[PDB]
Amino acid sequence: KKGSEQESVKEFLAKAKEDFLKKWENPAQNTAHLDQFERIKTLGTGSFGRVMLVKHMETGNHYAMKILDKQKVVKLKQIEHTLNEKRILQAVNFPFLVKLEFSFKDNSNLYMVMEYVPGGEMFSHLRRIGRFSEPHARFYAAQIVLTFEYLHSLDLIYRDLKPENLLIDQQGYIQVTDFGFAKRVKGRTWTLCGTPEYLAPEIILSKGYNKAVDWWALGVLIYEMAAGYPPFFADQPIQIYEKIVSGKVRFPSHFSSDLKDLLRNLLQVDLTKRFGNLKNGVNDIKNHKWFATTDWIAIYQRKVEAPFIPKFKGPGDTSNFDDYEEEEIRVSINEKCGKEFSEF
Amino acid sequence: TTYADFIASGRTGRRNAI
Numbered sequence: 001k002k003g004s005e006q007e008s009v010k011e012f013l014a015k016a017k018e019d020f021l022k023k024w025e026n027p028a029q030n031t032a033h034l035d036q037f038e039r040i041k042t043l044g045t046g047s048f049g050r051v052m053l054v055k056h057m058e059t060g061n062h063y064a065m066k067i068l069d070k071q072k073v074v075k076l077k078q079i080e081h082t083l084n085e086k087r088i089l090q091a092v093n094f095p096f097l098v099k100l101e102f103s104f105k106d107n108s109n110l111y112m113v114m115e116y117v118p119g120g121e122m123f124s125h126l127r128r129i130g131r132f133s134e135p136h137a138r139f140y141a142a143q144i145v146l147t148f149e150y151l152h153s154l155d156l157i158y159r160d161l162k163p164e165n166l167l168i169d170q171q172g173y174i175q176v177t178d179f180g181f182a183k184r185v186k187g188r189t190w191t192l193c194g195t196p197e198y199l200a201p202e203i204i205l206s207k208g209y210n211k212a213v214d215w216w217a218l219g220v221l222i223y224e225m226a227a228g229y230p231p232f233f234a235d236q237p238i239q240i241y242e243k244i245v246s247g248k249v250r251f252p253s254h255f256s257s258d259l260k261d262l263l264r265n266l267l268q269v270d271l272t273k274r275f276g277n278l279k280n281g282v283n284d285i286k287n288h289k290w291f292a293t294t295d296w297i298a299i300y301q302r303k304v305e306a307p308f309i310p311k312f313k314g315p316g317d318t319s320n321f322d323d324y325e326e327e328e329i330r331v332s333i334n335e336k337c338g339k340e341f342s343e344f
Numbered sequence: 345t346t347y348a349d350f351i352a353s354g355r356t357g358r359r360n361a362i
């Protein structure tokens with residue numbers, strides 16, 4: 001069970017935690033200004049606001065800029081979640097986590113300037129193709145496993161895993177982009193947050209929960225990638241919650257024996273039995289039969305040939321993204337919610 | 345089929361967080 005490989009992982013994670021804590025305790029703040037970027041096109045939207053493709057004039061580099069309206073964040077009671085999002089993203093460093101390059105704020109908005117991931121959302125490719133073959137889903141799943149091992153070792157819980165929040169880079173690798181619900185917490189937490197299809201039973205049942213919710217969400221992701229549909233779906237969220245808590249899951253007939261076995265252990269209502277939550281931690285997942293062909297080091301090093309490479313017309317191309325309604329940014333002459341977002 | 349039921353559902357588009 002315990003080997004030199006696990007010892008090298010432990011050592012790598014200890015140094016990664018040293019790097020994280022320095023940035024966590026002393027966050028980067030006010031590293032650019034809105035006027036340093038040319039706003040091109042909206043890549044996505046949320047209740048949070050919008051993410052736009054931008055060009056940094058000084059370098060000619062393209063970036064994705066998230067714009068959050070401070071008044072809307074306050075009305076939606078997302079102040080603490082927004083402060084968590086930026087404090088965490090500026091402090092993390094892993095090959096499958098999008099990099100935050102700059103952050104700043106003005107009278108009206110908060111801004112996060114991140115690397116632009118041009119391949120589009122996994123959601124877009126998954127819905128268009130229908131489903132991914134088991135080796136295709138395994139390649140993406142392996143990246144999430146490593147990412148969660150890294151995040152959890154830093155006492156971070158992710159809480160928003162889904163194809164809509166995973167982007168495909170130029171090399172066909174995953175970039176986790178959405179940290180709106182990420183939280184640094186040592187004990188248990190209670191916030192009702194996430195997406196209906198991805199919620200662990202303990203979240204629905206209003207129990208104190210922990211990082212085991214991310215392992216249940218990985219089970220949902222793997223199922224959705226391999227089936228083309230989620231394990232729990234219905235027209236209304238209440239019907240989805242009834243299915244999640246029931247203790248019943250059905251697998252397509254094309255799912256391999258190893259895939260169903262892994263999913264039964266991830267989509268496990270019983271926390272004393274859920275993979276990722278046992279004495280052996282992440283190793284119950286990494287060493288599962290479905291992952292036998294996975295070379296964890298080669299994935300981390302990005303040496304594995306991706307099963308799918310997105311089409312790239314050139315720099316600034318957004319063909320891999322849907323079109324969204326555009327709206328001009330308005331900066332008030334009066335500072336809004338200054339005290340609430342002082343640390344941003 | 346389960347796929348046809350999923351495709352005919354109102355939850356095949358981008359899903360909002362709760």
Ligand SMILES: c1nc(N2CCC3(CCCNC3)CC2)c2nc[nH]c2n1
Pocket residue numbers: 043044045046051064098114115116117118121164165166167177178
């Ligand atoms: C391209 N697009 C991004 N978007 C923000 C995330 C989003 C929109 C909000 C929900 N999750 C997917 C797609 C667009 C990026 N966020 C960071 N880098 C990005 N590169």
